[PDB]
Scaffold this active site. Structure first.
Site, PDB file in Angstrom:
ATOM      1  N   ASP A  86     -49.251  42.001 -42.183  1.00 56.82           N
ATOM      2  CA  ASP A  86     -49.298  41.534 -43.559  1.00 56.82           C
ATOM      3  C   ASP A  86     -50.511  42.172 -44.227  1.00 56.82           C
ATOM      4  O   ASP A  86     -51.624  42.091 -43.703  1.00 56.82           O
ATOM      5  CB  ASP A  86     -49.372  40.005 -43.611  1.00 56.82           C
ATOM      6  CG  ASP A  86     -50.029  39.485 -44.885  1.00 56.82           C
ATOM      7  OD1 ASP A  86     -49.633  39.915 -45.992  1.00 56.82           O
ATOM      8  OD2 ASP A  86     -50.937  38.630 -44.776  1.00 56.82           O
ATOM      9  N   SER A 101     -44.923  49.717 -61.288  1.00 56.32           N
ATOM     10  CA  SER A 101     -43.599  49.290 -61.734  1.00 56.32           C
ATOM     11  C   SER A 101     -43.495  49.628 -63.214  1.00 56.32           C
ATOM     12  O   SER A 101     -44.500  49.938 -63.861  1.00 56.32           O
ATOM     13  CB  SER A 101     -43.383  47.785 -61.493  1.00 56.32           C
ATOM     14  OG  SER A 101     -42.273  47.283 -62.199  1.00 56.32           O
ATOM     15  N   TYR A 152     -47.128  39.379 -61.571  1.00 56.93           N
ATOM     16  CA  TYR A 152     -46.564  40.677 -61.236  1.00 56.93           C
ATOM     17  C   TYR A 152     -47.011  41.744 -62.231  1.00 56.93           C
ATOM     18  O   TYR A 152     -47.534  42.794 -61.834  1.00 56.93           O
ATOM     19  CB  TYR A 152     -45.043  40.577 -61.196  1.00 56.93           C
ATOM     20  CG  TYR A 152     -44.362  41.841 -60.732  1.00 56.93           C
ATOM     21  CD1 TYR A 152     -44.314  42.165 -59.387  1.00 56.93           C
ATOM     22  CD2 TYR A 152     -43.748  42.702 -61.645  1.00 56.93           C
ATOM     23  CE1 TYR A 152     -43.665  43.320 -58.947  1.00 56.93           C
ATOM     24  CE2 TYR A 152     -43.102  43.844 -61.218  1.00 56.93           C
ATOM     25  CZ  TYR A 152     -43.068  44.152 -59.879  1.00 56.93           C
ATOM     26  OH  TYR A 152     -42.428  45.300 -59.470  1.00 56.93           O
ATOM     27  N   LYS A 163     -49.401  45.107 -61.681  1.00 59.01           N
ATOM     28  CA  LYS A 163     -48.860  46.454 -61.809  1.00 59.01           C
ATOM     29  C   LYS A 163     -49.626  47.252 -62.854  1.00 59.01           C
ATOM     30  O   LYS A 163     -49.775  48.470 -62.703  1.00 59.01           O
ATOM     31  CB  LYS A 163     -47.363  46.392 -62.111  1.00 59.01           C
ATOM     32  CG  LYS A 163     -46.566  45.743 -60.965  1.00 59.01           C
ATOM     33  CD  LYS A 163     -46.713  46.542 -59.672  1.00 59.01           C
ATOM     34  CE  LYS A 163     -46.060  45.855 -58.483  1.00 59.01           C
ATOM     35  NZ  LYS A 163     -46.251  46.612 -57.231  1.00 59.01           N
TER      36      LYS A 163
END
Lengths: 264, 264, 262, 264
Positions: free
Chosen positions: A66, A147, A160, A164
């Site tokens: 991880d 992204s 998120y 990004k």
């Protein structure tokens, strides 16, 4: 020669984080097809187990890790050192979608976990890879996976999007910092990428909006200029191009591979 | 396969404007090495005559044309129709540096000519190419040449910067407009590209600033993260990648090929 | 405090300043003690400037901004009356044609570039020698659009020129900064008034839909879900000419409710 | 009414994080001058004590809080609720410079602390403020403090740059998410702001590069187009404008207040 301009350098030592499934595996396998010595880390034991003895597939090394686990990260580099004996390319690919919800709805531990994996792990791998990459005969490379949410706003996906966008700034800073050492640093920004992960995203966003999956998916498709989801092989090809003579003068850039996602 | 992902489609019908010298010729020659049927236009009769009978160089068709001359642009497309029989790729490469000087110093006729060649000609070729490109078996592609001056400010080069920013806006609008038809539209932004053109630019800017050539050149190189000028072959390779299966899904983007020009 | 009050007594020229956004800006400056002059292509709009009960007098020149002789008349008029210049508001612009790039009239492409881009250069090149003598540090305020930060299908000349304006602003901010001249773009969104209604009508026809449906598509792609008022553009221009805003240069300020996409 | 356009709404309930010193105090004091009911939090007891009894300065409420401790943040909102009784403006100002050094040199603990304060605390305050701001009679506003390092790369400052780019993505996402509720969300990007903080930064970067303070300061100044540092009152002025009728329709934007920092 146009032929060899587009051929990745032979024999590259490549590490792909989160590289045993999805886009990361597409990248890892593509490099392996091009004579690279490839190592991946991945959080899924089943994904790692599935890599072995695939009939049409060159061997790839793997470490269970991880990426937010420092002891595990050090094992990844130890496994790389013991086999690859160096590093030419770091593919900072690992990431999670994080929670879907209003900023006042989302669980703080899920916010922090999204930041730890999507952003802090980029640093943890880059800090350890840089001393290796600066010794690469080809000029070292870092390829970070951002992204389209790193160049647009993304309602109900704030952790998120934050991470990004952070990756883009991290790339542009490292490109300046490491450029004189010869290390290229770029972000790839995938669009709406066909596969299991995006189906979970669409399903979760449909639930957030109170609409069906089919309608949610259609909203995504009509906001792609090409009206077609992106294939993982397009992300792999772009990573390969950055590691070819023709693309090895590109650095500091975010390359959106998305069919032109017009808005999120 | 990874090798097929990076190979341009075979048999592409390609028009490169300003294609008999410099970056345009590198692009034209690169496509011609990959089985394309290539036509160029160029303003220089001598450059056009220098194309023929070069060892290991596939033949390239040429039309003499100044892209600001609508009558000559029309003849370009007539020559293309009579030889290639259609069009798969328009490379909107033609452009000039324009004048060097403060906005209050430069000749208005040189501002106007910079706009006519760098911006208006892009429209003149795109409007004639779109009816052909929409019939391309592969979808069709417009590849516009912007500059790092299309993503940065450029003192003493305002007509050049205005037009190179304009090209990005044109690309992003056309990508949306033409996407559903299958036509991909992107800009390549070259950096400080090794060639006689950049040496003339450096000499002109040195004169503007009252410094010597070598000091001016050093200021440009220090502001490239990789500390070296971009090769024309890198621009060609990027154009080839956009016309490969692996790059086929990129549209609406400006890709800077520049070693990270940090500032102008 | 003083921070938000525009400098008193500014000498301001607004291009296309007798109607719409330009008049909004021109009147706003005149309310703040500025000596304002405008040019405009409509003599009817110019005639309407005078004898407006709540309105300080504004000087005016009849000028099509693509006409060089007319542009020189604007500066001669400004010099004879204002005697200098502290602010150039490069506001004049046209929507240009609506249609696919292969459908539009090339003459309308050229007209859009002439008015939205080349005229910016024509006014800036003549204002710079005046602006560099301003006590406050001279300003150029250029009117871009949200189409200068987004792609705009069926509006390619407009978008191309609005992106060009941003690049011109960023170049001029570097060039003129050491001379004290601030240079910024304002990017209006979907601005209420007659012009946007012509644009919506023209785009509805392009897409074969009704006016109301076209309008609703514009509104749902504004994060605030409401059109921008001209006074907002005027307020931003005033702020750039205040002590608190006068350290801003090189920027494009989108005043749009967050137009999410075009 | 041009004067009515630029003055902030009367009676705004404003919370400034990190508001007892530097830029945050300038913002807090500016709002207090315009009839606002202002509350700040700050990590320094000494900074808080210096707020009281300044000539012709309206009183400002304060809570002692490290923005990374959840219980202290809860007390901040408890004190706001008990005195302001609501919230119209959240100013997400708190931040740290983070470490100066190459990515392979910096202490990971200080990378993490930079992310915790500059990014995660923005979420911690925004998630608690949104339920209050959606009840604001004026609509509600978040003003986030990014940096020019959020629109540019910053070598040897990678955690700072990453977090300041993250704030932009967070702002653009929240602007879409909260827009239909009436909440405006913007980032202000200060440049090289005069104060003790930038002198520590310059000192630290001069030591990283092995030059003297004056040379390092001169490098910063020559890369500001206006050739002078930004005053904190400019940042406060911009925050006030965003809370006026004239600036009420701006949302989703990053506004750089910097004299045009040309590069970092």
């Amino acid at each position: 020669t146009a032929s060899d301009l587009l051929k990745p350098y032979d024999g590259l030592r490549v590490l792909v984080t989160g590289g045993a499934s999805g886009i990361g595996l597409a990248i890892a396998d593509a490099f392996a097809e091009c004579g690279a010595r490839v190592h991946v880390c991945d959080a899924s034991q089943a994904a790692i187990a599935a890599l072995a003895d695939r009939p049409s597939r060159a061997a790839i090394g793997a470490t269970l890790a991880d990426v937010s686990d420092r002891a595990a990260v050090e094992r990844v580099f130890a496994d790389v050192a013991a086999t690859l004996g160096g590093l030419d390319v770091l593919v900072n690919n690992a990431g999670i979608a994080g929670p879907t919800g209003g900023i006042d709805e989302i669980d703080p531990a899920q916010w922090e976990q999204t930041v730890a994996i999507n952003l802090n792990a980029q640093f943890e791998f880059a800090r350890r890879a840089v001393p290796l990459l600066r010794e690469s005969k080809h000029g070292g490379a870092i390829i970070a996976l951002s992204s389209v949410a790193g160049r647009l706003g993304y309602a109900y996906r704030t952790p998120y999007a934050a991470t990004k966008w952070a990756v883009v700034g991290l790339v542009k800073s490292l490109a300046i910092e490491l450029g004189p050492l010869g290390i290229r640093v770029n972000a790839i920004q995938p669009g709406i990428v066909r596969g299991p992960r995006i189906r979970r995203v669409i399903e979760a966003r449909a639930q957030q909006l109170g609409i069906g999956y089919d309608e949610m998916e259609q909203r995504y498709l009509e906001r792609i200029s090409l009206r077609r989801m992106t294939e993982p092989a397009e992300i792999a090809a772009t990573a390969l191009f950055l590691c070819s003579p023709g693309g090895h003068g590109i650095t500091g850039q975010a390359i959106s591979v998305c069919g032109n996602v017009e808005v999120l």
